[PDB]
């Protein structure tokens, strides 16, 4: 999960959302402020570990949860 967090943070710091730039600078600042929560255990990993025993409708997969999270954070930067 920290590997996936590192991939998301790297792809946020580089490759700006528009297909240096002000948007890239905003992405870098957002990654800098979200780094402490993603790194180590932090909020996200403990949240996942608790949410695995909560009952869901569809079977829960950590990559589905993190894909939702990453898309929502890209929307926050936008």
């Amino acid at each position: 999960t920290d590997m996936i967090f590192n991939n998301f943070l790297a792809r946020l710091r580089s490759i700006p959302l528009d297909e240096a730039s002000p948007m890239l600078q905003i992405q870098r600042d957002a990654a800098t402020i979200m780094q402490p929560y993603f790194t180590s255990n932090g909020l996200v990993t403990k949240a996942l570990e608790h949410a695995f025993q909560l009952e869901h409708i569809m079977d829960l997969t950590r990559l589905r949860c993190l894909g939702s999270l990453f898309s929502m954070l890209h929307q926050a930067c936008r």
Binding site: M3, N6, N7, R11, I15, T61, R62, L63
Partner: protein, 229 residues
């Protein structure tokens, strides 16, 4: 049809005789001892390891192990002649068994396999490594496409080790299955392996990705028209 064919029941092949004669033909001073230690070893691993759907320890696996053992013995002989006579044949078989069985094993079965190896071959040991150029190219590609690289005990250590095991399987094998739960790094693993092999050996890599269940079998292999052949 049944009266037009003569049936023979093949269920139990002499694995011990097969291994002994084949190791003797490959060239091994202790061929009989190696066979008598390698066939009951596969029998032991058949039961005492955990039961999985992707596990197999049959005659195909045994023959793959023996052929790879002959190949690595020949390459070690070439290396020593570069730098013969008495050679660690038990270490050669251990290297072949590890290189062929270890990637297949679940994480809870590697200590069991190594305990069985220490039981059968006392002076066995192991030697894994010496892939520095491929490791450096893997690190370069992983840094290129926003992936994390590990040294074995770092964060990406298990993933990089599995990539190297995949490379070994591609080298000494014919067809491959990357079995794992959804989100285990299989696609990234083989993609960075293909790119790193392209960077090392210069030969361009082409990958065709086919989903066999998104199309019918007739669209996957082909059809014969019933009217005209």
């Amino acid at each position: 049809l049944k009266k037009l064919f003569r049936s023979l029941a093949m269920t139990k092949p002499d694995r011990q005789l097969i291994a002994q004669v084949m190791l003797y033909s490959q060239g091994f001073r202790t061929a009989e001892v190696l066979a008598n230690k390698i066939v009951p070893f596969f029998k032991l691993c058949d039961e005492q390891l955990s039961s999985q759907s992707h596990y197999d320890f049959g005659l195909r696996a045994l023959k793959s192990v023996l052929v790879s053992a002959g190949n690595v013995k020949r390459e070690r002989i070439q290396k020593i002649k570069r730098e013969a006579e008495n050679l660690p044949e038990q270490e050669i078989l251990i290297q072949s068994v590890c290189e062929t069985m270890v990637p297949k094993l679940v994480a809870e079965d590697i200590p069991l396999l190594f305990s069985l190896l220490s039981d059968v071959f006392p002076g066995v040991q192991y030697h894994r490594g010496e892939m520095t150029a491929l490791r450096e190219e893997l690190k370069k590609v992983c840094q290129e496409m926003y992936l994390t690289y590990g040294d074995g005990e770092e964060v990406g250590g298990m993933w990089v080790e599995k990539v190297l095991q995949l490379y070994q399987i591609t080298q000494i094998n014919h067809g491959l299955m990357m079995v794992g739960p959804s989100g285990s790094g299989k696609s990234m693993a083989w993609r960075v392996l293909l790119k790193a092999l392209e960077r090392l050996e210069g030969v361009e890599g082409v990958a065709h990705i086919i989903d066999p269940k998104a199309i019918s079998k007739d669209h996957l292999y082909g059809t014969l028209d019933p009217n005209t052949r």
